[PDB]
Structure formats: C-alpha cells, structure tokens
Amino acid sequence: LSLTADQMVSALLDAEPPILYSEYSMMGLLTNLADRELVHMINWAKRVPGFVDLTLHDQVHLLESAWLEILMIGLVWRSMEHPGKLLFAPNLLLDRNQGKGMVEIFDMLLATSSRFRMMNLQGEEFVCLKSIILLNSGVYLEEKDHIHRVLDKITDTLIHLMAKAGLTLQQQHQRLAQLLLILSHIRHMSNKGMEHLYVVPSYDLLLEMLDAH
Amino acid sequence: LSLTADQMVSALLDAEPPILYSEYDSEASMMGLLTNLADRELVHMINWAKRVPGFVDLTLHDQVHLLESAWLEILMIGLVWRSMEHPGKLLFAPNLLLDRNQGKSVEGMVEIFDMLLATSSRFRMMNLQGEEFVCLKSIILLNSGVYTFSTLKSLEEKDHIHRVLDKITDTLIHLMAKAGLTLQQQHQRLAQLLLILSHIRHMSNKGMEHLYSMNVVPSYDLLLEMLDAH
Ligand SMILES: CCCN1CC(Oc2ccc([C@@H]3c4[nH]c5ccccc5c4C[C@@H](C)N3CC(C)(C)F)cc2)C1
Ligand SMILES: CCCN1CC(Oc2ccc([C@@H]3c4[nH]c5ccccc5c4C[C@@H](C)N3CC(C)(C)F)cc2)C1
C-alpha cells in the first residue's frame, strides 16, 4: 500500500498467471480448463498488493464473487489479436458457431474483446483492471475501508500509466471511465454465465487453494 | 456535444422524472404495489431518456434496445437515490417505505432488498450529490446495452454513444473540481462512482432472474410505442 505506482505495476505484472492448455465434449473442456485456471487465479490474487491483508474469510468471499469475471477478462485479453475468435487456450481457439445457450455468452465475450482491441488496451492497464475486479466484485468496516484504499491506489496507478503514455488529463479521466464502464459488461457476462450454469467453487475449495499460513 | 459541463448538468436536472406515489387508502399487496409502481415509472423514464443529450440522435430501434437493457437498472438507481437518507429503508414512494423484514414476505425478495439497501448505504457514505446522480443514471442508459447491439449505422451509433459518455465523464470531473476536490480525489471518486454501476448491473440481473421465476419485461413494441411518438 506504500508502493509507488511503478512498483504496483511491476508487482502485478510479475504476478500474472500462466497460459494453460486444454486437456484433450466442448462443455467438459471449458469446465476443466476453468477449474485448472482457478488455482492459478488464487495464487495470482495472493500477490495483488493489499489482498492478503484481508481476513481469509473476506479473501474467499472476494474470490467467490470475482472468479468468473476474472476468467472472462483474462479470456478476452488474450483473444484481442484474434477477431471473431476466443482463445481459451493456444490449442483451443473457438468461434461463435462452435458455441452452438453458449452462443450468447460467446457473442458478448467477442464484443468485449473487440472493444479492448478498439481501445488498444495495454498490458499494464489490463492487469490493473483485473485487480479492480477482484477487490470490487464482492464488497457489497475496517475491511471494506481497506479494500477501498487499495482500489483508490490502483486508480492512481492507472492514471499514472496514462500520464506516462502522454495522454492529457482529459484523456486520462475519459479513458479511465471507458475502462471502468467495461467492467459493468464483464459483470453482466459473469451473471449470465452463472445463470447459464444453474457448478460454483465452494467456500472450502477456495479456502483450501488459498493455502493458509 | 456542443453542451458545456454546466449545460449538461442543467439539461439532466431538468429531465428528471417526477417522484410518484403508491395508491392511497398488506404483505399480500406488496408485489402488486411494487409492480404497479414500476410500470408507471417506466412511462416517465421514456420521457426522461428522450431528454438525455444525444439519446434521440440514435435510431429508434437502438433507443428501444438501450431501454430494454437498462430499465431495471434505472428504476433501481432511482430507488437507491430516493432511499439514501433513510437508513434501513427503501423509499419506493413517499407513502411506500419498506424494510428488510417486509421483503421476507416474498421468496427471494429479501436478497434484492439487501443489495439495494447496501447500495443506498454506499451512496450515503460517499455523500453522493444530486448532480452526480443524474450523470450516473445517464451513463447507465447509454452504457448498459451498447455492448449488446456490426452494421455501418450501428458503428456510427456506438461512436456517438461513446462520445456522449466521454462528455458526461467530463461533466463529472467538472462537478468534482468545482466542489474543491484535488485532481487525485477527482479520479478516485470518478472510479468509486463508476464501480457502483457494476453492482447496479448485478442487482438488475438478480432481479430480472426473480421476475422470470414468477408481461415481466417491457416488450419491444411496448417500449417502441412509448418511444415512437408521432
Ligand atoms: C468446481 C469449480 C467450478 N468450475 C466448474 C466450472 O464451471 C465453468 C464451466 C464453463 C465455463 C466457461 C469458461 N471456461 C473458461 C476457461 C478459461 C477462461 C474463460 C472460460 C469460460 C467463460 C465461459 C465460456 N464459461 C461458460 C459460462 C460459465 C456458461 F459462461 C466456466 C466455468 C468452474
Ligand atoms: C412491462 C412489464 C414490466 N413491469 C412489470 C414490472 O415488474 C416489476 C415488479 C417489481 C419490481 C420491483 C420494483 N419496483 C420499483 C418501483 C420503483 C423503483 C424501483 C422498483 C423495484 C426494484 C425491485 C424491488 N423490483 C423487484 C425485482 C424482482 C428485483 F425486480 C420491478 C419490476 C416491471
């Protein structure tokens, strides 16, 4: 929390999870791949500055509410350079008709990817967005206060990055807004995803992955 | 887009729909009252939407689609705003003030009440201002459905929508600056405010999911007919 903006970025970049491969019907592959990415997400979350300062109870709650959103923005980020296609894994690249109630979700994921592409979303930016999702998704006294301080710190970092890129102050606030409004759509996709399922990772499973002290 | 920030706020403040009342004269009545109230607010919402800058510049079908996507979000943020200075209560109408336990009377309603009450609590501890609220409501209208529209006309709509969003963002920053916030505090509050929209989306989806467990959404032509004036 005392880290500089530059230290925050580098920490988050270093904390980035690996790209996994699909173990190989299509629903089993997407399920299995999601299950394996979950473990690496948990270990990513532990390295997000300020996260392990929360109680384990609250860490689990945040992960319970954020896990699908984080899977999805990750999917969308690496699918950027592959228009009309979703790169779940290097050996699992699917289009919208391979989705044929998954096509609607595929479509939404595809639109979000094109949005990122259009915005020319940078790696240093995406990684901040992912941290914000983790901390923001489940927050609805000392703990909520801490979460909001970390969120504020990431906001600073995002603004710093845009300043470094040479964007004017007006462009900074405008780009910040565009990025955060995208999180609304990711939230929506996660909701529909959870709906199209009804499954979820239990409290105990997440707590186990967290590998307590 | 020629509007200044001051002119943006003014237009949004004038576009504000009226505060409506529940009928004048029971837990078995609750859902009926909440449904009747929602239907009546919908009418004023369409009029409000038309007076949001840039909205009527859009095609009628894109206008319908934005409202199909955002109508429950808009209802809810209005409710949350009305309830801000009434801790533990949801002010659906000045004569319809409900709490948690009254929500219990309907299956799965207490969870939605809790989320709405928590959002009201968030607005409270942020000391959300009226000028900020109408900006946030406008953003919901323009942003919620824009990612679920490739035709050339549609590409032009999206660019227009994103440019109006940019302007509302400029308006939000302006308001926070006049209030005397530092630059750092301005971006920080802008972020905090926009993050709440994620949760409002969340609530709309949970609530939409309730409704299908029991006319539940406005039909295309219903919204069309109200939007498609002569
Ligand atoms: C027991 C632990 C919980 N796991 C069961 C498993 O349930 C899922 C089943 C399918 C999906 C897919 C999926 N898989 C991914 C792998 C890497 C990155 C993105 C994804 C997604 C997003 C999306 C296609 N998911 C389908 C869904 C949930 C209906 F939207 C996500 C979760 C998560
Ligand atoms: C054209 C058909 C669509 N209308 C039928 C009507 O269905 C509803 C029935 C109940 C609700 C309530 C409700 N009512 C309000 C009145 C003014 C402002 C806010 C509200 C809300 C939010 C919330 C409590 N709604 C319940 C629910 C299930 C979450 F949608 C929302 C919609 C909307």
Swiss-Prot record, chain B:
Binding site for 17beta-estradiol: E41, R82, H210
Variant or mutagenesis effect after changing L222A: Abolishes interaction with NCOA1, NCOA2 and NCOA3
Effect on the protein upon substituting Y220A: Reduces PELP1-mediated activation of transcriptional activity
Outcome when changing Q63H: In ESTRR; results in highly reduced activity
Region (Self-association): 1-230
Lipid-bearing positions (S-palmitoyl cysteine): C135
Stretch list, region Interaction with AKAP13: 1-230
Impact reported for V52E: Has higher transcriptional activity in the absence of wild type ER. Inhibits transcriptional activity when coexpressed with the wild type receptor
Domain of life: Eukaryota
Post-translational modification: Phosphorylated by cyclin A/CDK2 and CK1. Phosphorylation probably enhances transcriptional activity. Self-association induces phosphorylation. Phosphorylated by LMTK3 in vitro. Glycosylated; contains N-acetylglucosamine, probably O-linked.
Tissue distribution of the protein: Widely expressed. Not expressed in the pituitary gland.
Compartments, record wording: Nucleus; Golgi apparatus; Cell membrane
Residue positions, PTM Phosphotyrosine: Y220
Quaternary structure and interacting proteins, as annotated: Binds DNA as a homodimer. Can form a heterodimer with ESR2. Interacts with FOXC2, MAP1S, SLC30A9, UBE1C and NCOA3 coactivator. Interacts with PELP1, the interaction is enhanced by 17-beta-estradiol, the interaction increases ESR1 transcriptional activity. Interacts with EP300; the interaction is estrogen-dependent and enhanced by CITED1. Interacts with CITED1; the interaction is estrogen-dependent. Interacts with NCOA5 and NCOA6 coactivators. Interacts with NCOA7; the interaction is a ligand-inducible. Interacts with PHB2, and UBE1C. Interacts with AKAP13. Interacts with CUEDC2.
Pathological condition linked to this protein in its record: Estrogen resistance: A disorder characterized by partial or complete resistance to estrogens, in the presence of elevated estrogen serum levels. Clinical features include absence of the pubertal growth spurt, delayed bone maturation, unfused epiphyses, reduced bone mineral density, osteoporosis, continued growth into adulthood and very tall adult stature. Glucose intolerance, hyperinsulinemia and lipid abnormalities may also be present.
Record remark on domains: Composed of three domains: a modulating N-terminal domain, a DNA-binding domain and a C-terminal ligand-binding domain. The modulating domain, also known as A/B or AF-1 domain has a ligand-independent transactivation function. The C-terminus contains a ligand-dependent transactivation domain, also known as E/F or AF-2 domain which overlaps with the ligand binding domain. AF-1 and AF-2 activate transcription independently and synergistically and act in a promoter- and cell-specific manner. AF-1 seems to provide the major transactivation function in differentiated cells.
Note: Selective estrogen receptor modulators (SERMs), such as tamoxifen, raloxifene, toremifene, lasofoxifene, clomifene, femarelle and ormeloxifene, have tissue selective agonistic and antagonistic effects on the estrogen receptor (ER). They interfere with the ER association with coactivators or corepressors, mainly involving the AF-2 domain.
UniProt similarity note: Belongs to the nuclear hormone receptor family. NR3 subfamily.
Name recorded for this polypeptide: Estrogen receptor
Organism: Homo sapiens
Range within the parent protein: 308 to 547 of 595
